[PDB]
């Protein structure tokens, strides 16, 4: 095991960290419950462990192999963060992905003084810090999800984003599921497969299961309402409006005869006797707020049936008075027999908003032709006739389908294009394609077989925080930093470019090298767009790195883009061309096109 | 079908398109199509009632402020009907542009209601506030400079003709409404400008001779005068600002420097958050105005500069005594519209009560332009007299609730409530509308002295934000700018204004001289050396010299500015069609067409995103277009140490080199500014300094030596 572990406990949560002697690997967590820390404490089964000395719960460290306890000054964080930064030569540690991650980093700094200490060894072979995950979500950085316009786009505004394409929910409730959904991608094939199905048999009944959808409305509101006891009297008869609504649903998805389909039938129950006490209890439109009276219907008890009469055709106003107060204990008193099955109503509230995601998600499927995708063992992906599935909505021009092939014996393709070619469309495009898979969705390609993706990384942006302290070569660089450290056999990494903040000689080098280290020891599935043509002859020298080329035809002036994907290299990007499109003067393209010719020529 | 539901349905079709919030009873509430959009908007339950079932959905009147909240930041426009006599009728129609509610509104950000009419010459474009009052009109002729105008006011509700043109910059814009075109006209338009002012003609306003503007404004006045129901009298001047009078900036120029949002969209880390500290609301909206649109008008910014060096040295006597008086203007909104709340009018009380005190401070200090100051704001002695009497020291938040009159305003008031608590409920009925009787009276009281008030609440804001200014400039060290007839920015010891605050590290300042002998500088440096900073840190000196404000250097010479043009970064709008060289050569594009010997042209990394040879090429075309022919002062940064090689082919561009030395395979950044070029750009230190892995840095190395050696 030879593995060297820290712990440490705040008010925040509990902070631990990992050091192999065998391999250098230096990890942290930051685990936020007792019980998950004393999994997270047997599954690292740690040699030797060290504590705060007020550590306030021994018990998770009771009886560990070679425990032993180091004094406060060692676990400060100030003092980590100093000792960690100078171990690895790094200005922030923003690159290895463990910045953020306050208690995982004050146990590490524990750790890297005591591993100094029992041998000076191991100190010149630790080179980082990465955080540990297993997480079923497939894990995407805050980077990756606005690059992606996964729902919100790089400007800040809700439109031209993928849930904007999938978000045509029925109900409140299923839009913000469909968001959960896009964020939490479940990595599980068998969620998955249960999802899939139940979109392709509601596909045939979504026009008839979502005018029934509709009018149930937003259950969730009202049932945590209902919780606090702050539900209003129209909020109950909301609640009474989607107990009538019901059997009408189960009655439709009883025709359907699939295993996922009749689970989600049962969730959402008929609850007769909840519906039988709100519609005996309560009058057709009860008034906004309880305290006027007039919420209880005649019926439901007696003697505020008879005060009611004696209060309508001063001693009277006295029996108004009773009237109202009866009429707000027989109120409380609904609240008390609706509660104990608030845990049911709450199963149901949610099965109903997955039938309204899956509904939606099957319309979506027969109105823009998507196809489902099948799950394999091995880490690759192949789309045959792939779309964007954003940029074919809002493209008023035809898309034209570009079929993608990723497997351990070709895992990386160096796209290389003309400006405009369609090269990022394309990459984003594979990247967009994988997260619809993995939440459960029909894919927009003809065929797709997805493998397994632990993480999706997008390197596209290059922007600079002045007051940060980061330029903008050291953002580009950080996020290059996260995803050679951070990497895995299942990754896939999507780079837009690499040493275009740099000279030309710099950033082919750093390019090369990363491009060699991507395929070569990370061994991820990787597509990188680059305007290097030197890069091209990577592929000869490297196994598992192809060659893919976009097409344009130039003819006088202008340029026509095919944006079609074929093997090759292309060699040539017509920057000149596209320059004259975007309005650059005529002078100033002649200008260029006659240095262009020198710069070759010599 | 019923008499009720056949009234509602008669005021509906009065006001089709915007929801009806129909008192009935205590609780407020829409019907059919309004009821299910406000049940999604609002959050609130939908009930069917049957009269063909009717939708209906209810809100409580004593809440409706909160709900109206989340429908005007939704951008819904939500007509509120009451009854009269039921006799009833929309008493006032809430819209996001014109909200001069507390709740309502932001209290450091302006809600401007816009207009924009294409007319076949060119674009008019007409904003209007209705709490401070101000009516700007501009004429902008190119679909850039409309964009620009959009991006700058950011208004809150734009009103577009039916047939406007291009629905293309105005598309995705919040609160967007299609207006007749009717509304349009000329001679209509003119009529009712001319009696809002009182004016016969607009000869004075110097607005009568722009067309296409006036026609925007005529609909933008008849709008405020229909979603208020009242006459304005806040609105009394039209304004035109014109392409002359301030130094252009497009909408990417604004947001590189950092003005007043960040690249990520916060507020933290700007231009604003710096030089902001202003103890009034009024204070913080000024200066933010003042950022955005500097005035190019020498003997505004002499008058202002004076001002902050008089008032430097009682700036700590002056802020406590500003922070007292408060949103004056905001309040003042209020009483023109008649709308406003007791507790306004212990507000504007507490200001006139501070009055005195400012007065006398600033009539000690000796300066033409502070003694302008100290005259425009008065003393308000007959208000305040009435304000002490009339209300109670703390009075309640609404009028009916009683107790908003002190005693001994009125002899019959206090009497027929002492009467009550000594016919009791006779008493109180009779003492409550007496109460409001005699709150509306205080109104016409105030009311005729309104135009003083509205220039009193200019003159304290200008005081704060001068009085912001020299405070900063003390304790951030920043010096006054001077003025020079021909085109030049001469720079000694300056210094980023954000940057230095919140790097703890010291700032290094480096000097800067552009002139027409020295029009272009090319700045080749180490990665991470701090080009961007020095090109950022001219661009923030000339914006903060032109607003009148101390710039942040020892010695600044600054001469006429146009435009500033900022080419910084790289995007991609793949929806839009753009791609990432597509966003740079548009953005390119506009600097090399648009720009004069005047402007200020920033541009950084230009030609990346491309291969090498056709990003040179392009690089040097357009410094040779900037230099050669448009001969605008430029500073460009470059890593392609070709284009170094400039200077010694063209007159009147020099090379500057920020330096670093280089340790061990470390880097060691001194970040001042040297004449000279550098050959190396250092990238593989920057790399490792991230974190790049160790083993990738070292094949790197021996890449980069193996294409050294092929050349
Ligand atoms: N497969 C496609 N079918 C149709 N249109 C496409 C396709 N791919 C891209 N486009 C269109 O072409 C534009 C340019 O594609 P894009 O990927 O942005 O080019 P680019 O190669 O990234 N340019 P650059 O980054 O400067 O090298 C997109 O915004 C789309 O409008
Ligand atoms: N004059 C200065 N004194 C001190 N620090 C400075 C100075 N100028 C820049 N910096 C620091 O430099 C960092 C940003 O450098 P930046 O201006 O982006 O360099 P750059 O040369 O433009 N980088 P790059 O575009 O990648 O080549 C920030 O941490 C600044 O605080
Ligand atoms: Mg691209
Ligand atoms: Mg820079």
């Given at each position: 095991d030879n593995?060297?572990?820290?712990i440490?406990?705040?008010?925040?949560?509990?902070?631990?960290?990992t050091?192999?002697?065998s391999?250098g690997?230096?990890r942290?967590?930051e685990?936020?419950?007792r019980?998950?820390?004393?999994?997270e404490?047997?599954?690292?089964?740690?040699?030797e462990l060290?504590?705060?000395e007020?550590?306030?719960?021994?018990?998770?460290i009771?009886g560990?192999?070679?425990?032993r306890r180091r004094?406060?000054?060692?676990?400060?964080?100030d003092?980590?963060?100093?000792?960690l930064?100078?171990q690895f030569?790094?200005?922030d540690?923003?690159?290895?992905?463990?910045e953020?991650?306050?208690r995982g980093?004050?146990?590490?700094?524990?750790?890297?003084q005591?591993?100094?200490d029992?041998?000076?060894?191991?100190?010149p072979?630790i080179?980082?810090i990465?955080?540990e995950?297993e997480?079923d979500?497939?894990?995407?950085?805050?980077?990756?999800?606005?690059?992606?316009e996964?729902?919100?786009?790089?400007?800040?505004?809700?439109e031209?984003?993928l849930?904007?394409v999938?978000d045509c929910?029925?109900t409140?409730?299923?839009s913000?599921m469909?968001?959960?959904?896009?964020?939490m991608?479940?990595?599980?094939t068998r969620?998955?497969?249960?999802?899939?199905q139940?979109?392709?048999?509601?596909?045939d009944?979504?026009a008839?299961?979502?005018?029934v959808?509709?009018?149930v409305?937003?259950?969730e509101?009202?049932?945590?309402?209902?919780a606090?006891?702050?539900?209003?009297?129209?909020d109950?008869a909301?609640?009474?409006h989607?107990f009538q609504?019901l059997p009408?649903?189960?009655?439709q998805?009883?025709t359907?005869d699939?295993?996922?389909?009749?689970?989600?039938?049962?969730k959402?129950?008929?609850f007769?006797?909840?519906?039988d006490l709100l519609?005996?209890?309560?009058?057709?439109?009860?008034?906004?707020?309880?305290?006027?009276?007039?919420?209880?219907?005649?019926?439901?008890?007696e003697?505020?049936?008879?005060?009611?009469?004696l209060?309508?055709?001063?001693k009277?106003l006295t029996?108004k008075?009773?009237?109202?107060?009866?009429?707000?204990?027989?109120?409380?008193?609904?609240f008390?027999?609706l509660?104990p099955?608030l845990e049911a109503?709450?199963?149901?509230?949610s099965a109903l908003?997955?039938?309204?995601?899956?509904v939606?998600?099957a319309?979506?499927a027969?109105?823009?032709n998507?196809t489902?995708?099948?799950?394999?063992?091995?880490?690759?992906?192949?789309?045959?006739?792939?779309?964007?599935p954003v940029?074919?909505?809002?493209?008023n021009?035809?898309?034209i389908a570009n079929?993608?092939n990723?497997?351990?014996?070709?895992?990386?393709?160096?796209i290389?294009?003309?400006?405009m070619g369609?090269?990022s469309t394309?990459?984003?495009?594979?990247?967009?394609i994988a997260?619809?898979?993995?939440?459960?969705?029909?894919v927009?390609?003809?065929?797709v077989e997805?493998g397994?993706?632990?993480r999706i990384?997008?390197?596209?942006g290059?922007?600079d925080?002045?007051?940060?302290?980061?330029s903008?070569?050291?953002?580009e660089?950080?996020?290059?930093?996260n995803?050679?450290?951070?990497?895995?056999?299942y990754?896939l990494?999507?780079?837009?470019?690499?040493?275009?903040?740099?000279?030309?000689?710099?950033?082919?080098?750093?390019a090369?090298?990363?491009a060699?280290?991507?395929?070569?020891?990370?061994?991820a599935l990787?597509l990188?767009?680059?305007?290097?043509f030197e890069?091209?002859q990577?592929?000869?020298?490297?196994?598992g790195?192809?060659?893919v080329h976009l097409?344009?035809?130039?003819?006088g002036?202008?340029?026509?883009?095919?944006?079609?994907?074929?093997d090759?290299a292309?060699?040539?990007s017509?920057?000149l061309a596209?320059?004259?499109?975007?309005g650059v003067?005529?002078?100033?393209?002649?200008?260029?096109r006659?240095?262009?010719?020198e710069?070759?020529?010599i």
């Open positions: 593995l060297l572990a820290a440490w406990q705040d008010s925040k949560g509990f902070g631990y960290a050091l192999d002697i391999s690997r230096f942290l967590s685990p936020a419950d019980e998950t820390m004393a999994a404490l047997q599954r690292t089964n740690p040699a060290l504590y705060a007020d550590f306030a719960e021994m018990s998770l009771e560990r192999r070679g425990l004094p406060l000054w060692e676990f400060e964080i003092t980590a963060r100093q000792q930064n100078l030569g790094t200005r540690l923003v690159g290895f992905g463990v953020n991650a306050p980093l004050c146990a590490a700094g524990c750790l890297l005591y591993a100094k029992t041998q000076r060894t191991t100190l072979h080179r980082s990465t955080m995950r997480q979500s497939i894990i995407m950085d805050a980077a990756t999800r606005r690059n992606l996964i729902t919100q786009n790089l400007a800040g505004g809700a031209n984003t849930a904007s999938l929910t029925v409140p409730m299923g913000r469909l968001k959960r959904w896009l964020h991608p479940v990595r599980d969620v998955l497969l249960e999802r899939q139940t979109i392709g048999a509601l596909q009944f979504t008839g299961l979502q005018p959808l509709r009018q409305g937003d259950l509101r009202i049932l945590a309402r209902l606090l006891r702050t539900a209003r009297p129209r109950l909301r609640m009474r989607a609504q009408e649903l189960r009655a998805l009883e359907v699939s295993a996922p389909v009749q689970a989600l039938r049962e959402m129950g008929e007769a006797e909840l519906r519609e005996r209890a309560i009058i057709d439109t009860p008034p906004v707020l309880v305290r006027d009276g007039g919420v209880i219907a005649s019926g439901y008890n003697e505020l049936d008879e005060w009611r009469a209060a309508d055709g001063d009277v029996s008075g009773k009237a109202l107060a009866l009429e707000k204990q027989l109120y409380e008193e609904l008390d027999l509660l099955h109503l709450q199963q149901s509230a908003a997955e039938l309204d995601v899956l939606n998600l319309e979506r027969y109105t823009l998507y489902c995708p099948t799950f394999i063992d091995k880490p690759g992906i192949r789309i045959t006739e792939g779309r964007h940029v074919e909505q809002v493209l021009e035809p898309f079929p993608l990723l497997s351990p014996q070709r895992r990386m393709l160096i290389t294009g003309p400006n369609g090269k394309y990459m984003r495009q594979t990247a967009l997260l619809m898979a993995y939440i459960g969705s029909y927009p390609a003809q065929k997805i397994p993706i632990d990384f997008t390197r596209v290059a922007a925080d002045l007051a940060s302290g980061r903008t070569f050291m953002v660089m950080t996020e290059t930093a995803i050679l450290h951070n990497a895995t056999e990754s990494v999507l780079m837009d470019e690499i040493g275009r903040g740099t000279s030309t000689y710099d950033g082919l080098s750093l090369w090298a990363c060699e280290n991507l395929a070569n020891k990370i061994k990787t990188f767009a680059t305007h290097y890069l091209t990577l592929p000869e020298k490297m196994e790195v192809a060659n097409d344009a035809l130039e003819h002036d202008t340029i026509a883009f095919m944006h079609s994907v074929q090759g292309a060699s040539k017509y920057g596209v320059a004259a499109l975007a003067p005529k002078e100033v393209i002649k200008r260029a006659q240095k262009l010719r710069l070759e020529s």
